[PDB]
Design a protein around this ligand. Structure first.
Ligand SMILES: O=c1ccn([C@@H]2O[C@H](COP(=O)(O)O)[C@@H](O)[C@H]2O)c(=O)[nH]1
Length: 134
C-alpha cells in the first residue's frame, strides 16, 4: 500500500519473548537504535526510548503483561513483540491485542533483532506504517 505520513511513535513498548541469553540487552538496544534511525529517515519516527522493555516466557505471560501495559502507560501506541521462531506466543499476542484489549502489536523474529539489515528494518517500518496508518 501507499506510505502514510504524519505518524510519530512516542510511546511504545518492547516485549521480548526470546530468551535473554539468545537476544541480549545490547541486541535489543542496537536494534532499537537502527530502527529509530531508519524510521526517522522515512518520516515515521519511532522514539529511541521505549516506555517499557521486558523479557517474558510463554503464551500465558502475554495477557497479564499486556493488561499491565494498558493499565500503566497512557498513550501507548505500539507493542513490539520479539519472537523466537515459530511459537504459539504469536497467536496469543494477536488474540489479546486485536481481540481483547485493542492494542496494536508488531511482531518481529529474534534473528532480525540479533542482526539487523536495512531491508529487514524497512520491512518492519512498512508493517508498522500500515498498522498505525489508517
Ligand atoms: O510463530 C510465529 C508467527 C509470526 N512471527 C513473525 O511475526 C511477524 C509479523 O507480525 P505481525 O505483522 O502480524 O505483527 C513476522 O515477520 C513473522 O515471521 C514469528 O516470529 N513466529
Amino acid at each position: 500500500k501507499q506510505f502514510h505520513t504524519g505518524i510519530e511513535i512516542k510511546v511504545w513498548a518492547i516485549a521480548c519473548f526470546a530468551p535473554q541469553r539468545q537476544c541480549t540487552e545490547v541486541h535489543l538496544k542496537s536494534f532499537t537504535e537502527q530502527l529509530r534511525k531508519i524510521s526517522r529517515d522515512a518520516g515515521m519516527p519511532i522514539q529511541g526510548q521505549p516506555c517499557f522493555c521486558k523479557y517474558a516466557q510463554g503464551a500465558d505471560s502475554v495477557e497479564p503483561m499486556f493488561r499491565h501495559l494498558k493499565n500503566t502507560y497512557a498513550g501507548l501506541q505500539l507493542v513490539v513483540v520479539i519472537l523466537p521462531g515459530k511459537t504459539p506466543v504469536y497467536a496469543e499476542v494477536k488474540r489479546v491485542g486485536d481481540t481483547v484489549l485493542g492494542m496494536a502489536t508488531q511482531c518481529v523474529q529474534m534473528k532480525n533483532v540479533q542482526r539487523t539489515t536495512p531491508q529487514t528494518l524497512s520491512n518492519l517500518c512498512l508493517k508498522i506504517n500500515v498498522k498505525l496508518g489508517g
